Amino acid sequence: AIRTISKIELSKIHNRYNLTVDFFNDLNVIHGKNGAGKSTLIHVIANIVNGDFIRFAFLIFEEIKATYSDGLKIVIRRDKIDEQSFISVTLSNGKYIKFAVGEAMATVREIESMLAMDIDKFVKENELQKVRASYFPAFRTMLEAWSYNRKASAFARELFGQFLPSINYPSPMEIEDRLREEIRRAQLGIAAYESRTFSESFVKVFSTGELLKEIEGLAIAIKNGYYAEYSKVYEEIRSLINRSGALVVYRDALRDRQDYQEKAFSEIDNYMSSVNSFLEDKEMAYDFYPKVGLKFPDGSWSPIRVLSSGERQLLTMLYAASKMAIVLIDEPEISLHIDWQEDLLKRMLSQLSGRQIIVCTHSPSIATGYEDFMINISPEFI
Amino acid sequence: IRTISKIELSKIHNRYNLTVDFFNDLNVIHGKNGAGKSTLIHVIANIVNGDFIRFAFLIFEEIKATYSDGLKIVIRRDKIDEQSFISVTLSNGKYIKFAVGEAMATVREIESMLAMDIDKFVKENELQKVRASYFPAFRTMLEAWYNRKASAFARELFGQFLPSINYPSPMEIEDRLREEIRRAQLGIAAYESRTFSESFVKVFSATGELLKEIEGLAISKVYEEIRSLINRSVSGALVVYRDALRDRQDYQEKAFSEIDNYMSSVNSFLEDKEMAYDFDLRRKYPKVGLKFPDGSWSPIRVLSSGERQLLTMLYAASKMVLIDEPEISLHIDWQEDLLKRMLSQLSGRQIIVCTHSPSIATGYEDFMINISPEFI
Structure with missing residues (x-):
């Protein structure tokens, strides 16, 4: 990435508390118990960095300040005049855009485009989409449920509100087709x-x-070619x-x-080695049209349906880490044994170098070896 | 009450043998992932709660189920004339046998003679005295899509061996509470x-x-x-x-009282937020949601996945047992107190839980049975 996030100040979000978190340019391991608004903070960051500020029309707040590393300041305020709310996105460069909340709601119900073009022109003329942030949701089992899928974004915005950013995350039932195609x-x-x-x-x-x-x-000197005549x-x-x-x-x-x-x-052998680093007494491989699946030391073959939620989390996270800026991961400790929680960040930091890796975990086992990066969240109730 | 005493699986998936002795209550199985915890839970839910036709979709050699009173159920998958036959042989009772492909055709018809035969077999022997409830580890998928199509939806991506899925999602328990x-x-x-x-x-x-x-x-x-x-x-x-x-x-x-206990159960876990109901000033239509100490109200959509797991776990425990992964997206204190909160509301039944994190099994370390698959 270039413009790494330095400090974000959220004032009176959901009318409950104020929160100001300072981020490093490197790893950011936020550790805190549920109900801390961690998910909200991740959605705010993903709706600021990726140029989707129109989702902030669906959010109740007072003042949101986002400071990058280079010095760009973004101040977002929600002010209502004559019973109509207007969101003012004022950048440090001098320009500032304001728009009605109801206009964005009407545009969203239209998708069920002038304001969308205005937002695109604003983020293009100010170059706000230099760094794109990837969002890893904590509800990826729901993405497995509606098995990158594009209707999953609408489903998650239907049941989590329209503030939720664009959902681009691979299911276990899509990465099999992706691996076979590759x-x-x-x-x-x-x-x-x-x-x-x-x-x-x-x-x-x-x-x-x-x-x-x-x-x-x-x-x-399998790796046999498709054209067997050669x-x-x-x-x-x-x-x-x-x-x-x-x-x-x-x-x-x-x-x-x-x-x-x-x-x-080599790219798929790297992904296979990354998968087989965690897994023991079971190898994921591409033995032979290509067949992709599990293998055992007994020589038996098995489909990808025998895999546990833990192994499914590792598949969906290691594929979406190899296929990669700023990376935001929500709850990587789900359904994992403690040793894999200990080694997961070291494996992902070995496979994802050169980007701002922000992770949010409830279990401290994830943050071993990076205790200086452990930023503890604390809600300052209004 | 025929509680499960000992389950012996021989060559399950033609991979491993497993023999687990269970207590009469609070079977806290602790073991790392990939040990087929969910498998064994599905096997128990397909034995105790009836519905043995799902065993036609399973590859096995010998499955023996022992209850507390002494009832033994032996299930074998034997093929002779290139067709696999499931033999359900009960202790001191008649044995039933059926073709695997006939049961597959009976299941694909739903997409009924054998179903009536299985129902008559389990009814004349009285095998449904105690019903075991199954709490899946993928209840977020149930939130994503009581309901009867959810069982087929989960069996689509977990195989047809998967038992009947009867679990309440959020935005459905809101309707249930408002109706109550x-x-x-x-x-x-x-x-x-x-x-x-x-x-x-x-x-x-x-x-x-x-x-x-x-x-x-x-x-x-x-x-x-x-x-x-x-x-x-x-x-x-x-x-x-x-x-x-x-x-x-x-x-x-x-x-x-029936709802206030559940509210207290919610207010036992939740901090700095109370979940309660209020009536309108004109129509008295009940709203159920949060009540902040500032007096502000908010819908049940602001709740985190953790709190939603607590909502889905405290509900349907009062409305009464196999629980799969109750440590999902939970704080360490909540993992410490979840079993202690649930044992008062679920007392009097065999509560089997399978957790990957030992934090769930604090204070009940004598019940921690460590699973280990003995590969053939």
Whole structure:
């Protein structure tokens, strides 16, 4: 990210309490018991950072101040004139926009667009959408229930109010299709690099025993291509090896084929290693059309339906951490054993580097090893 | 009361064997995820609560269920002529057998001879004396979508072995509480008219300290006129008046007692916020929601997932047992006090809970049975 959040001041939100939280540029582990408005704070941040300030028309507040790292100040006030409420979003740059709450309510019931275009023009001419924040809700089981889905945003705004931001989160029943599509697409990518290597190596060939030994070693080196005819041309190459400059060209082509073979599947092998780091006595893999699922040391195969809520939380969180700015995670301790809660932040900090990772947990087991980042929330009741 | 004593699963999913001995009450199973805690709970809910046809969707070898009185149920899945048959053999009773594919076709028909056969088999042997309630660990999904389609919805993504899902969601318990308040208001109004007609008949049929106590105890607005008249042999009937007023007060308390206990249960956990009901100034339509110490009111949608788990767990425990993962989205103090709050409201039944966090099992460490799958 660039404009990291430094300090957010919420005054009289829901007419109950005032809250001012200072954030670092790094990890932000907010620890506090339920009812602290942590979820609200996350929705406020996700409705400020991602340019969706129109959702603030559905929120009851007095004064909301958001300060970034570079020095941009956003002051939001809810003032009503002649029985009609107007939200004033005043930036530190000089410009300020104001709009009626009822106009935004009418626009939302229209979606069931002038103000939407006005908000888009305001955030585009002021460049308020430089950093996009990803929202990980604490109700991802509900996203599994209506199995990224786009109607889930409307369902969650239906039963949690219209202040809720856009919901883009992957279900267990969508990541199976996503993984199958990515594996077949990577196999097709391997086949296209085979055909490009054939045409380029034809042109290059048209223009020692160690090179022959290297070709014999590289002939043996699942990762089989989709176009099996090229696997049969490779079988014929191995059969010919069993039976100068052009040999160097052949060796370079085989080495580039092996390197692209590793590089096409490296992203999914990283995700599989990230999953299998937690899991014990059970491996998630892509044994063979691609089949994706669990494997056991007995050699038995099993569908992804045997997985527990804990393992489902790990799948839905590690896939949505690899496929990534500012990352906001709500309740990562759900249905997890204490050791996985201990190692979850270290695994996600190993896979998500270079971004502002804000997490909100109720269990302190999540915040081991990062106790200096533990910002304790406290509601200052009005 | 045939409480579960010992469950022996042999080669469940053709993976592992498990034999667990259960107490008569408060079976707090503690173990880390992936141990099939939910599995065993579904097995118990498909044995105790009837509905053995779901066992046709399960791959197993031998399942033995022992109750407290001594009833043994042996379920086996045996295939001979390339068709699997489920053999439900009871202790000292008749045994029933059926094809797996026939039961699958019977279930797919709902998408009934075998269903009637299973119902007759479990009815003639009296296997439904004690019913076990299933509290799923995915009750947020029940909030997402009593209700009968929710069972099929959950069986869609958890398999057809999953038992019947009967669990109340938020925004449905609000309707249940409002309906109960409306029913209590109609009950009070009918008891007013019944008390008026009965006291009319009894006064027509027939000390000053008792009259003073009756005047003090007086609190639609006929009681206000009675108190105004009291402020300004035969007197036995006056004693009847005091008794009638006292009986009215007693019925009034009982009318709200069923909901006030649940409100107290809510107010046992919740801090700096009270959940209560109020009536309108014009139509007396009940609103149920929060009451802040500032006097401000708010709907039940401001409540957090934690408080919603507390709402869904304190309700349907009073309306009475297998609970799956009661530690979800809960504070450590709430995990400490949840079993202590629920044991007063759920006493007298076998309460089986399965938790991943040992904080739930504080104060009941003698009941902590650690599950361990013995892989074949």
